[PDB]
């Protein structure tokens, strides 16, 4: 009976490939040649944030584009004012092995998680003035690798147990569980309309999930090795994935197939972080070679390098207004770039 | 601009208080040594954990053990709440002082798996600086298995037949030559990978530990002291 299912899956995959080939009548690189290139881009580090003892593993900007939360493996969750460099808050974490941190869109809460398999949510704006843990979401059986807030009450967290989960924070229970991945889910991205989200996993595949239904809307493949960074295009119709095979790929949700590939011969180091510019014209990717590269996401020509970090560039983010880019590395320093 | 000045003053005062707290936390973060405990289920890494607990706790997957030797703090983390695909979370332990690697040397069937895990750890891009304290647990079981026969190690390692015990060995007084040859063969099997890559930036520290062994804390202390001594000696423009 297993052979019949294998043959059915093979013919379904063949149909998928044939439909994609039929729809792939052109490439993004063909007709974008006439587009004027973005040109060489230099953006010096406007600020340097230095208060972290150990390597920075994640960060997240605030929706006001001024405050930003960062996580370090020493066990701290410093909130920085990117303008005045002052540390607004410094949350000591129960477990120092944290791989992710999130900033609520309202700004009232900050989430974090990691090797403890627990998503801890801290109420920033308490009545007493001190930051205390407001919730401890448990139920993931692997390390937590990404956290993103839908709102003050709903949070989507990806884990190393090959599953994503949407939690109702008020009750603290898994509202829904997205189980389609084969490897560890390394990063997720909420859509601008927050009705869908893409998760890239350690199975060299990304998946589009719809939040309400809880089903795998779409599946995208093409990466040789495992994906460890992902983010939507500003319109939510596309996303980008950085992988350990030292390449980024831009997929489009509607076309259901890979659109662009960003890679170079001298780049043999895996991408650690990926984000888009405000317009999506620029794709900023932090690599293992201690550098961050800026890609013309429409032409796939490397236009800009954010050199200046002494260790692996673990985390990377761009503000909602696009004014600044914060890159954090394993040398325990964040850098605000513009 | 009175409101702006007051806001800036309050922000600076909060930043100063937080920075003082951060200095206080830094004075203790550098005063402790992080240790990553690795091994298979059969290896008595939990046994070592309990033995140095007699000399701290964990229930969220990670088991944390805090111990002190000569007023020096060691924090050891046994990551036991994940899946067996460790190629991703292990990169968290790049700044760890040392990786304790516990090997069940009694059973030869899983010894090649332990050797391959050691190879991956030693040759990892983010772990090629970390030194490994190799504990070869269950030496009494290995002695009994070797002396009892009917459990030939040559079946799993053909090159054992063309192997003689090293001249610079330190066998126990009441120890059979055969078990000395076997255990030093296992140690040299691990040292073959150890002394094949990573030129001088990290070293392996093999140890022969039984089920009960109260010197494990002192051995870790001495090996970490040697690791830090080598790090200091490398500060003189060496690399």
């Amino acid at each position, epitope marked *: 009976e297993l052979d019949q299912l294998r043959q059915e899956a093979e013919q379904l995959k063949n149909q998928i490939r044939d439909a994609r080939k039929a729809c792939a009548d052109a490439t993004l690189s063909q007709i974008t040649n006439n587009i004027d290139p973005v040109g060489r881009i230099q953006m010096r580090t406007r600020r340097t944030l230095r208060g972290h003892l150990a390597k920075i593993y994640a960060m997240h900007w605030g929706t006001d584009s001024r405050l930003l939360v960062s996580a370090s493996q020493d066990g701290k969750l410093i909130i920085w004012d990117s303008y005045t460099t002052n540390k607004v808050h410094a949350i000591p974490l129960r477990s120092s092995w944290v791989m992710t941190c999130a900033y609520a869109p309202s700004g009232n809460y900050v989430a974090c998680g990691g090797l403890d398999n627990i998503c801890s949510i801290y109420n920033l704006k308490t009545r007493e003035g001190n930051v205390r843990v407001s919730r401890e979401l448990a139920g993931h059986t692997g390390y937590l690798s990404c956290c993103r807030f839908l709102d003050d009450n709903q949070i989507v967290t990806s884990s190393g147990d090959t599953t994503c989960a949407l939690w109702d924070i008020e009750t603290g229970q898994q509202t829904t569980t997205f189980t389609g991945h084969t490897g560890d889910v390394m990063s997720l991205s909420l859509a601008p309309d927050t009705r869908l989200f893409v998760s890239g996993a350690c199975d060299a595949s990304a998946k589009l999930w719809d939040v309400r239904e809880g089903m795998c809307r779409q599946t995208f493949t093409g990466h040789e090795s495992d994906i460890n960074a992902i983010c939507f295009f500003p319109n939510g119709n596309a996303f980008a994935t950085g992988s350990d095979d030292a390449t980024c790929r831009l997929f489009d949700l509607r076309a259901d197939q890979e659109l662009m590939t960003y890679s170079h011969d001298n780049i043999i180091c895996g991408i650690t972080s990926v984000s888009f510019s405000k317009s999506g014209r620029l794709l900023l990717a932090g690599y293992d070679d201690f550098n961050c590269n800026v890609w013309d996401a429409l032409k796939a020509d490397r236009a800009g390098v954010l050199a200046g970090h002494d260790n692996r560039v673990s985390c990377l983010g761009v503000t909602d207004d696009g004014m600044a880019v914060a890159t954090g590395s394993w040398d325990s320093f964040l850098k605000i770039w513009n | 601009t009175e409101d702006q000045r007051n806001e800036e003053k309050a922000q600076r005062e909060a930043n100063k208080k937080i920075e003082k707290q951060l200095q206080k936390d830094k004075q203790v973060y550098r005063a402790t040594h992080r240790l990553l405990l690795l091994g298979a289920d059969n290896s008595g890494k939990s046994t070592i954990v309990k033995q140095m607990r007699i000399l701290s706790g964990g229930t969220s997957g990670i088991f944390e053990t805090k111990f002190q030797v000569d007023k020096v703090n060691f924090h050891m983390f046994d990551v036991g709440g994940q899946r067996d695909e460790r190629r991703k979370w292990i990169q968290c332990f790049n700044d760890v002082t040392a990786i304790i690697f516990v090997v069940d040397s009694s059973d030869y069937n899983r010894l090649q*798996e332990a050797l*391959n895990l050691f*190879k991956s750890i030693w040759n990892n891009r983010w772990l090629r600086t970390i030194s490994v304290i190799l504990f070869l647990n269950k030496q009494d079981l290995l002695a009994e298995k070797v002396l009892a026969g009917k459990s030939k190690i040559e079946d799993y390692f053909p090159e054992f037949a063309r192997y003689t015990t090293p001249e610079d060995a330190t066998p126990e007084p009441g120890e059979d030559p055969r078990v000395t040859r076997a255990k030093y063969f296992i140690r040299d099997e691990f040292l073959r990978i150890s002394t094949a890559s990573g030129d001088g930036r990290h070293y392996c520290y093999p140890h022969f530990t039984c089920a009960v062994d109260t010197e494990n804390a002192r051995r870790i202390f001495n090996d970490c002291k040697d690791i830090i001594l080598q790090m200091n000696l490398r500060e003189y423009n060496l690399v």
Partner: nanobody
Amino acid sequence: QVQLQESGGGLVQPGGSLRLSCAASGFTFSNYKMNWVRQAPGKGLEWVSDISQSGASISYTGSVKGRFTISRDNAKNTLYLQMNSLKPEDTAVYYCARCPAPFTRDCFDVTSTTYAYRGQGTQVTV
């Protein structure tokens, strides 16, 4: 997408010979170290042998050191394991495993939680 399709093997006499082949698609065969692992009934996956990116650091487990010979063809993107003097202990299912990342000397491929870059397998009964 990456795919490792195994072929060869089956029913062989206790002492005969076989050759397992592994066709790789979706990735550059040259940049990855390849492995042969196997899973016999009653026990979990075990690593049989591996070969480096070019084919200069061939290594084997001790039980197959003198018999099995692993060899890769980058032009054909294929991985072969030539088995001879087969014993009944080789009655496992043989999987062609691929190391997770290119240009690396470290591999974690024996995992029983469905390692992604591992083939479907071939039954080799002796």
